[PDB]
């Protein structure tokens, strides 16, 4: 039995024609206090997987160490560690999914929601979700927390089903993600303007973008809004 | 101690071609104990039919209340109340007891004597009107009735066919609910004749 203390908010992601995109803001909230502002919640594993984590940050840092240790362990007695026997997104996910369920089953969960985004060795896109309960599911778009309520609707307008994936380019897909991050800044009280974004492409590989900001915001109309009903001044 | 599921019971209503049907089970129990197998849940005020599920004391009370109000209506208006108007009266009366409600699931059914249009409607316990073209369901086996009606129903059924559809909807739903059954009644309502049939069903 836990309660989460320092927490991270939404992680959003989607598939596109050649790969996957995933994003998450750089905030570590302490209840209503926006305590930490330099927190990276996207963690790359190799050059073909990115694990996006929301929820408790102490448990996130534990999971970081596990993934870091997983790479080390895989390299042991493995001449093909940087080739055929390298870590796949599906391997990394199933490992985490095993841990998450084992921990919930011992009534001592890792208080997180995780999205493992990556590209497999055969070029297939990998995108799957797992949480503190050990619950797992996959979809063309995946999001945690407020992302599930606000991002998914927007991302599903681009990729509503499987057949829409080949039709979606990296330009269109990234635009939708960046737009979603803005909407979350408008409406999520535990979000920040600064965020990180990662693209895993089957051709161009892993592109990790840091220190992004929400921009092109609409606030001008606020000046015209006066009172809450009658008031004219 | 859930008022709506102490006594048990079900009501279902359907529309057909120039006709409506309303049906109910006959069980009145006290939780597990079956007490009465003659407890009818469908009443009528003129040509307007009202079915009521839920707490039996309120079923009785509301029948007596709507008999009261429709009798005064008829004396003052000098005509029988219509289904559309009666529906509004039920909604008013239930919402009047908003913060101390009758624990019931009423169902109005009938044919408007002026326009000849078939009419059915349902309510929640605080009087929210649920109007419908196809069918209305109510009672402890409402989930079951929803499933039966949604699959069995088709529009513009003749009275003789409509009887079979509603009867099978009620019977098979009642047999999957412990607190419903113990007999059943089906009213087939045409413009100026009404046939009442007692169904043979399993008595457990």
């Amino acid at each position: 039995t836990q309660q989460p203390i320092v927490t991270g908010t939404s992680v959003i992601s989607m598939k596109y024609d050649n790969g996957v995109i995933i994003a998450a803001d750089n905030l570590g909230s302490y209840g209503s206090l926006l305590r930490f502002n330099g927190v990276e919640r996207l963690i790359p594993v190799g050059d073909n997987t990115v694990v996006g984590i929301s929820g408790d940050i102490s448990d996130m840092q534990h999971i970081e160490r596990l993934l870091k240790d997983l790479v080390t362990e895989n390299a042991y007695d493995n001449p093909l560690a940087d080739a055929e026997e390298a870590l796949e997104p599906s391997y990394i996910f199933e490992y985490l999914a095993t841990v998450m369920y084992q921990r919930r089953s011992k009534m001592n969960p890792l208080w997180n929601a995780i999205i493992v985004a990556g590209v497999q060795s055969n070029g297939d896109q990998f995108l799957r979700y797992v949480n503190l309960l050990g619950v797992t599911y996959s979809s063309p778009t995946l999001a945690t927390g407020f992302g599930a309520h606000m991002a998914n609707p927007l991302l599903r307008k681009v990729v509503d089903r499987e057949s829409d994936i080949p039709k979606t380019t990296v330009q269109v897909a990234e635009e939708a993600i960046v737009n979603a991050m803005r909407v979350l800044y408008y409406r999520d009280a535990r979000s920040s303007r600064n965020f990180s974004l990662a693209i895993i492409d089957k051709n161009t590989g892993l592109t990790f973008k840091k220190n992004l900001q929400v921009e092109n915001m609409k606030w001008d109309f606020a000046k015209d809004i006066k009172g809450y009903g009658t008031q004219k001044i | 101690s859930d008022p709506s599921s102490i006594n048990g019971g079900i009501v279902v209503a359907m529309t057909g071609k120039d006709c409506v049907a309303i049906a109910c089970d006959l069980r009145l129990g006290s939780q597990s104990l079956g007490v009465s197998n003659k407890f009818e849940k469908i009443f009528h005020y003129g040509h307007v039919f009202l079915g009521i599920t839920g707490l039996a004391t309120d079923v009785t009370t509301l029948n007596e209340m709507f008999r009261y109000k429709t009798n005064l209506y008829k004396l003052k208006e000098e005509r029988a109340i219509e289904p559309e108007t009666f529906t509004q009266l039920v909604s008013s009366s239930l919402y009047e007891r908003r913060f101390g409600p009758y624990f019931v699931g009423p169902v109005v059914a009938g044919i408007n004597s002026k326009s000849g249009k078939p009419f059915i409607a349902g309510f929640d316990l605080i009087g929210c009107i649920d109007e419908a073209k196809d069918f209305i369901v109510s009672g402890t086996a409402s989930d079951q009735l929803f499933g039966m009606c949604e699959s069995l129903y088709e529009p513009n059924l003749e009275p003789e066919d409509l009887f079979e559809t509603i009867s099978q909807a009620l019977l098979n739903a009642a047999d999957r609910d412990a607190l419903s059954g113990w007999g059943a009644v089906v009213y087939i309502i045409k413009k100026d004749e009404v046939v009442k049939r007692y169904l043979k069903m399993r008595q457990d």
Partner: protein
């Protein structure tokens, strides 16, 4: 207050009501009559919360007796039962409801028919050929389902009633100290002294 039964036969209504009055670990009385005569051809047995039962029974009795004097006329069992139900239907939504369950056995002189009504504390009325309140029903209903016939005589009804009491005395956990049986028919109400 525990066991109250009722059986409507061809020409009469028979009410059986337990004699025991218990509080705590003591049977305070074993000769208690759990019934009141509402009118010459109408009898009401009762069972429920202590104090409430008699207070309610006598209040109903007073009201029916007042009606009888005012109109110089006896109300029908159907009319009495409807009056009683409404009182309980009001009661349930009061600050402190009457926690009383009743059986109303009566003989309708206009119809020349016996009538048995079962009403619970919520105001739930049902006309029945045989009725019971409390845990009694869990034994007696199934027993009567089997042995009861609609055309039985009063003597056959009493034997049918003996069969119920025997079963209750065998399987009920509490000692209810037997029953007082009363018969309601065309000639009024009378008590069976030897049961």
């Amino acid at each position: 207050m525990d066991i109250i039964l009722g059986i409507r036969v061809q020409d009469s209504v028979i009410l059986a009501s337990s004699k025991a009055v218990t509080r705590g670990i003591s049977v305070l009385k074993d000769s208690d009559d759990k019934t009141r005569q509402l009118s010459p051809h109408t009898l009401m047995s009762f069972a429920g919360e202590a104090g409430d039962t008699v207070q309610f029974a006598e209040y109903i009795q007073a009201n029916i007796q007042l009606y009888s004097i005012r109109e110089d006329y006896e109300l029908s069992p159907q009319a009495v039962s409807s009056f009683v139900r409404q009182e309980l239907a009001k009661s349930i939504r009061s600050r402190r409801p009457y926690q009383v369950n009743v059986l109303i056995g009566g003989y309708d002189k206009k119809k020349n028919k016996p009538e048995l009504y079962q009403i619970d504390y919520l105001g739930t009325k049902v006309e029945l050929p045989y009725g019971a309140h409390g845990y009694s029903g869990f034994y007696t209903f199934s027993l009567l389902d089997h042995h009861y016939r609609p055309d039985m005589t009063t003597e056959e009804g009493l034997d049918l009633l003996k069969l119920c009491v025997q079963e209750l005395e065998k399987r009920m956990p509490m000692d209810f100290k037997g029953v007082i049986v009363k018969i309601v028919d065309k000639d009024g109400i009378r008590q069976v002294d030897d049961f």
